[PDB]
Amino acid sequence: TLGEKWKSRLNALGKSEFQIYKKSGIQEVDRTLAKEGIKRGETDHHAVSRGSAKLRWFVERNMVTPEGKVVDLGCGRGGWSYYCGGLKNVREVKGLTKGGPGHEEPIPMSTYGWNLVRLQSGVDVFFIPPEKCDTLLCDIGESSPNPTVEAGRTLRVLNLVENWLNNNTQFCIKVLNPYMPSVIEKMEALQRKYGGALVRNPLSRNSTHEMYWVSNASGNIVSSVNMISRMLINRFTMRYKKATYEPDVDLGSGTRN
Ligand SMILES: Nc1ncnc2c1ncn2[C@@H]1O[C@H](CSCC[C@H](N)C(=O)O)[C@@H](O)[C@H]1O
């Protein structure tokens, strides 16, 4: 497929060439100071990761309207959870991850609405009973040189999420590899059953073909992905181009009643 061609080409790049391509013409969050602040123990204002700004991109465009009880599957440090904790119609946020050595452990913060957020690692979302929620978030998906490996991992995530959804469910779910036939088929059925569409976030690096399945979006799946495969391929042709930066998000401080 067109995406697989992109994948072959990506795997043939040298080290230096990869790092450059990875950032060419993408959008980037200015994280220097937020990171230095967290390192000094600062728990107010800062986003634990660039995932906050990433999720904000979708939310400010109403592609996902987090509300009620939010479940963040694979929350990592908590970037997505903490951001939702400060959102108007959100009442509760539950984030889950593996954590442990060689894995991202959630960081305790005092950002706005932190008291509405509960994080816990040592949990493998794939084998715990599904819970009820109003919005389901999931940013799971480890990339690999081999697209068939990504296809399976992706299909696992899609089936995992299919269990946590009902209808009225707001959702933003990462789809690591959306171009492999197997994943495309699944997405067509899921779209057919739960709506929404796939969207490319300008903050995603060129090194990944990741797209997110957002509930409040529309668009033909096959058409979605290809449009993006062509983009990523075109970006290979770029010379001496870097990312455009933007200020990170300020998450406030304070509790919510
Ligand atoms: N089976 C599983 N169960 C729980 N967590 C998992 C998992 N597989 C992967 N993960 C976690 O999924 C996380 C995805 S990266 C998290 C980004 C987060 N949205 C943020 O903005 O900070 C990784 O940290 C990984 O540790």
Side-chain angles (χ1 to χ4, degrees):
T1 68
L2 211 178
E4 308 196 34
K5 173 174 181 173
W6 164 77
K7 192 64 176 172
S8 301
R9 198 161 170 196
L10 178 62
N11 289 316
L13 258 33
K15 293 188 181 305
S16 195
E17 293 167 298
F18 187 84
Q19 288 311 128
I20 297 173
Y21 170 64
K22 189 177 183 178
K23 309 272 203 162
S24 311
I26 70 167
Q27 245 174 286
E28 273 267 4
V29 171
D30 174 357
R31 297 228 75 205
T32 303
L33 302 184
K35 277 158 75 178
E36 206 53 3
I38 288 174
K39 191 172 185 171
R40 298 188 223 100
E42 284 172 42
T43 65
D44 275 335
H45 296 297
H46 313 310
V48 290
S49 65
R50 45 188 145 69
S52 288
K54 195 171 184 176
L55 209 202
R56 180 183 57 169
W57 192 82
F58 292 125
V59 175
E60 68 190 6
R61 297 186 170 60
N62 311 316
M63 298 179 158
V64 181
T65 303
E67 72 210 327
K69 176 190 174 181
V70 172
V71 172
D72 191 355
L73 265 15
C75 69
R77 286 179 287 177
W80 279 20
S81 297
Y82 283 136
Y83 173 68
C84 292
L87 297 172
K88 207 181 295 178
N89 285 53
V90 168
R91 190 140 182 179
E92 171 191 353
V93 175
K94 194 173 180 185
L96 317 167
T97 37
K98 293 167 55 188
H103 287 306
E104 298 302 282
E105 293 282 18
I107 302 174
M109 295 291 282
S110 59
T111 48
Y112 187 54
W114 67 269
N115 67 109
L116 303 178
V117 186
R118 282 185 168 171
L119 302 179
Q120 50 177 294
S121 56
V123 179
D124 178 301
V125 306
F126 297 91
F127 300 83
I128 65 174
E131 288 178 45
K132 297 191 180 181
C133 54
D134 309 298
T135 96
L136 184 71
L137 307 175
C138 188
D139 205 15
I140 295 172
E142 168 183 35
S143 81
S144 174
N146 173 301
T148 32
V149 173
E150 302 190 317
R153 290 179 179 170
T154 300
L155 286 180
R156 291 182 77 245
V157 171
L158 288 182
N159 288 308
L160 199 197
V161 303
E162 188 180 14
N163 293 317
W164 294 63
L165 299 174
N166 63 295
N167 245 303
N168 290 176
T169 314
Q170 280 296 106
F171 56 75
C172 178
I173 300 170
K174 173 182 167 175
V175 174
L176 177 65
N177 195 314
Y179 56 94
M180 291 306 261
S182 41
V183 183
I184 277 187
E185 172 174 56
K186 186 52 177 176
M187 279 301 308
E188 292 183 304
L190 286 180
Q191 178 182 59
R192 213 135 51 202
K193 215 164 191 176
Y194 301 91
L198 297 165
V199 177
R200 177 63 179 192
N201 189 132
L203 290 168
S204 287
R205 281 58 195 290
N206 295 326
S207 59
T208 172
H209 196 299
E210 76 180 0
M211 288 179 83
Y212 289 73
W213 181 29
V214 288
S215 57
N216 309 167
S218 58
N220 174 63
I221 285 171
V222 173
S223 185
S224 290
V225 195
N226 281 326
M227 188 187 294
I228 294 305
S229 288
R230 284 188 281 278
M231 182 187 82
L232 302 177
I233 281 169
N234 295 325
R235 291 178 177 197
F236 279 124
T237 78
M238 286 188 165
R239 265 61 210 167
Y240 303 88
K241 298 309 163 63
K242 300 282 192 175
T244 290
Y245 276 75
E246 72 183 14
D248 189 7
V249 65
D250 181 342
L251 295 180
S253 54
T255 64
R256 288 178 70 185
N257 50 298

